[PDB]
Design a protein around this ligand. Structure first.
Ligand code: HEC
Ligand code: HEC
Ligand SMILES: C[C@@H](O)[C@@H](O)C1CNc2nc(N)[nH]c(=O)c2N1
Ligand SMILES: C[C@@H](O)[C@@H](O)C1CNc2nc(N)[nH]c(=O)c2N1
Ligand SMILES: [Zn+2]
Lengths: 421, 421
């Protein structure tokens, strides 16, 4: 029938039925729940070296069309019918189909709306879709990315956009961006072992170096794009510096914060995910929104496996960093997340705080149930990395599940890539 | 056959094989994860009006005996085997069996060990077992409870202990405590519609008033113990005042914090849970450990559905509480907690901070994997309510599964209790 979920903070309740249309791909069983695995194969869509069998594609193609037309306020039977018929015929002779513009626009938004780990989904209906499905070379890919980057940065007043590259055909002619994000910092392996910059990008930074990129050994060096057109070997392109907007970190109270000399790019763009829609697979679809303080001030800067700066910021504040009991870490993280939120506003760049963020999610979630009796959500990913229960999401029971369209993970390209040269 | 989980913060990895011995009672399926439902039926063991059938009990009885005996440094072949015959004949002639003193102790410490939601499991070895299975009256329960409260408080040097009342027989003579904790403040529904005290307890506070208790309409009024002996109607017993060690809240720097007139008890003791062991169910097993700061500072004080003191302290600090983006709520929560952890240390009462607790769990978790190659863990409860990404458990992948012995949830007595008067 349906499972009920409650909100212990508000007392509000929802009846989720949408979950019945989910895809039986999760790994949890009545014996054990595996909801805390970060990158599960269950949420990953691997590579193929052979087209998707037309037969298997047909059921899915029909399913999407149905959903597409099932979405209209006022039905359009003829078109709906005609399309089901029209698409059945195309897959028969062609062995695959093409999405109309409106369909691609619809698919990218629903896929976003169907993103369990995203808290910004309130915007799910405001997305700029760049149709680059006719692209054919690495250089083009680059120029499209630059166009996307310019539109989204919008001089600081950031906007959500996505550029969809050619869909997967036989799986051997994949168009993919190798970096995890369009804009991200290098990570250098020093001669003494220590890492320089963002330790999370060592593997990728080395690949650029091996491919001819010149290392500068900086703390905040912008990695070049490692593009792959038509399954060819990846080529390097460097995003033009003026296109990459950054923000310098400063605390409104602590005069010394700027001496730490930190900064960060303003545009957060996921570049390596795979868009799945009606049986089609677009391994090339970089998208973006705007930042949420916590992502930078807590994760990027304070994760031990990253810039790990809590130590120093504790020293500067002169807190008793010798004993945890004093909660110096908690105090520091706060000042660090206030710096990011302040700095960004001071430079007039769009950013959001976890409070406002969590708050808009609730309105969104309430609408999702009021519209389709469902909203797939992954608690572990939605609740902010600090002040967790201060935000209303921490008290929201939720169900996680995969739908369609959907944004899947992909296996690192350099792990499965056979080098032609 | 196993599941690899890792810690993205340290890179350490474990292989879990213990989840295979778990009970298939979870509700997660391949089509949807429900790991975030707070008080699920899966984790609850409700009432019944007939005794546990022997055909279903025997297996479980034996399985426990094997498990208990398989926990010895050196096997006790004869004892182990003889014990199985005894339980069988016993279950065969009376339709049930009695555990021994050592088996009971084993069961409780083991149950604690399998509590996925307890972050303080590193202490499972140190537990005091008060045998009250020969109990037979509400006043006798009251006495046992006061005995427990005294041994545990130990004048500030808290000690973990558990009291076990009679095991369940036919299911109509249940020995249980209706409250959720041996110590807990009342919730008064005022006439203006507001709530005085702990709003989390409006229902039990009323049931008390309905049972002759006199309301003092205070802000921290210790509630009486509603005791159900031998399935009879409940009866109130007031825990002797000052047999209730409490802590007054003071902030090391903010001298105005005292003026808030806040305090909390020092003994955290769950009372309304059921202990399942070898097929036997013990509906009355109150036990306690010692508070972890956040329990009081983050949740008890700041949850809007609780004392909700977040704004009032925000105005005291002068923080711009009208702009979420200023992170004023985050400023508050930290100080409130700084306070909580400070007070306890001041009156010399055992308290543990969320950082040190996490640090120890990681230690326990490695031990548990080396040892039993498993560790049922519920991520959603282990990550602290404030400063998540700062603790190691936040980047720790884990598996949540139900083993045996086990501490289950029960249906609030008053909803199912058939009154006599
Ligand atoms: C409107 C601005 C906006 C905000 C704010 C926003 N998102 Fe998301 N978002 C995702 C996906 C997919 C994930 C999950 C990322 C992952 O698993 O690595 C995500 C994750 C996140 C996360 C968690 C990331 C982490 O690593 O902790 C935050 C925070 C977030 N989004 C904020 C697709 C989108 C899309 C795609 C059309 C858009 C537009 C989008 N998101 C727009 C936004
Ligand atoms: C005899 C069993 C037992 C002992 C002893 C015990 N715990 Fe637990 N603990 C539990 C169980 C069961 C739960 C889950 C409670 C629930 O789901 O309501 C729990 C939950 C918790 C929680 C989270 C619950 C919440 O409501 O936020 C914390 C924090 C905790 N324990 C700390 C400790 C500490 C610190 C100690 C002392 C070393 C301790 N525990 C000793 C059984 C125990
Ligand atoms: C323990 C593991 O699941 C972990 O790395 C998590 C949990 N929740 C998260 N939630 C978000 N939004 N982003 C993350 O990277 C993570 N990582
Ligand atoms: C499930 C969610 O909606 C929520 O109520 C949570 C999450 N984590 C928790 N963790 C602990 N330790 N105690 C709780 O009561 C909760 N509640
Ligand atoms: Zn699950």
């Amino acid at each position: 029938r349906h499972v009920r979920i409650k909100n212990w903070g508000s007392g509000m309740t929802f009846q989720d039925t949408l979950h019945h249309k989910a895809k039986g791909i999760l790994t949890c069983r009545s014996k054990s729940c595996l909801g805390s695995i970060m990158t599960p194969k269950s949420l990953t869509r691997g590579p193929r070296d052979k087209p998707t069998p037309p037969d298997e594609l047909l059921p899915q193609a029909i399913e999407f069309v149905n959903q597409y037309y099932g979405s209209f306020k006022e039905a359009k039977i003829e078109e709906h019918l005609a399309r089901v018929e029209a698409v059945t015929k195309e897959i028969e002779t062609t062995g695959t189909y093409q999405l109309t513009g409106d369909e691609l626009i619809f698919a990218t938004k629903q896929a976003w709306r169907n993103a369990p780990r995203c808290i910004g989904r309130i915007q799910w209906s405001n997305l700029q879709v760049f149709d680059a499905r006719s692209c054919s070379t690495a250089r083009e890919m680059f120029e499209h990315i630059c166009r996307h980057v310019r539109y989204s940065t919008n001089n600081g007043n950031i906007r959500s956009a996505i550029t969809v590259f050619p869909q997967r055909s036989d799986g051997k002619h994949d168009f993919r961006v190798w970096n995890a994000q369009l804009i991200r910092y290098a990570g250098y392996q020093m001669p003494d072992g220590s890492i320089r910059g963002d330790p999370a990008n060592v593997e990728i930074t080395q690949l650029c170096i091996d491919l001819g990129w010149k290392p500068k050994y900086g703390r905040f060096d912008v990695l070049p794009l490692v593009l792959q057109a038509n399954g060819r070997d990846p080529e390097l392109f460097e995003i033009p510096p003026d296109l990459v907007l950054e923000v310098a970190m400063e605390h409104p109270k602590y005069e010394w914060f700027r001496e730490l000399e930190l900064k960060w790019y303003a545009l957060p763009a996921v570049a390596n995910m795979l868009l799945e829609v009606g049986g089609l697979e677009f391994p090339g679809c970089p998208f973006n929104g705007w930042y949420m303080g916590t992502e930078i001030g807590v994760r990027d800067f304070c994760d031990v496996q990253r810039y790990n700066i809590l130590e120093e910021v504790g020293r500067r504040m002169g807190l008793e960093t010798h004993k945890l009991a004093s909660l110096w870490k908690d105090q520091a993280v706060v000042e660090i997340n206030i710096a990011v939120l302040h700095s960004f506003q001071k430079q007039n760049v769009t950013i959001m705080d976890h409070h406002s963020a969590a708050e808009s999610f609730m309105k969104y979630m309430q609408n999702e149930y009021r519209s389709r009796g469902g909203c797939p959500a992954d608690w572990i990913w939605l609740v902010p990395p600090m002040s967790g229960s201060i935000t209303p999401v921490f008290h929201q029971e939720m169900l996680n599940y995969v739908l369609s369209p959907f944004y899947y993970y992909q296996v690192e390209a350099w792990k499965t890539h056979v080098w032609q040269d």
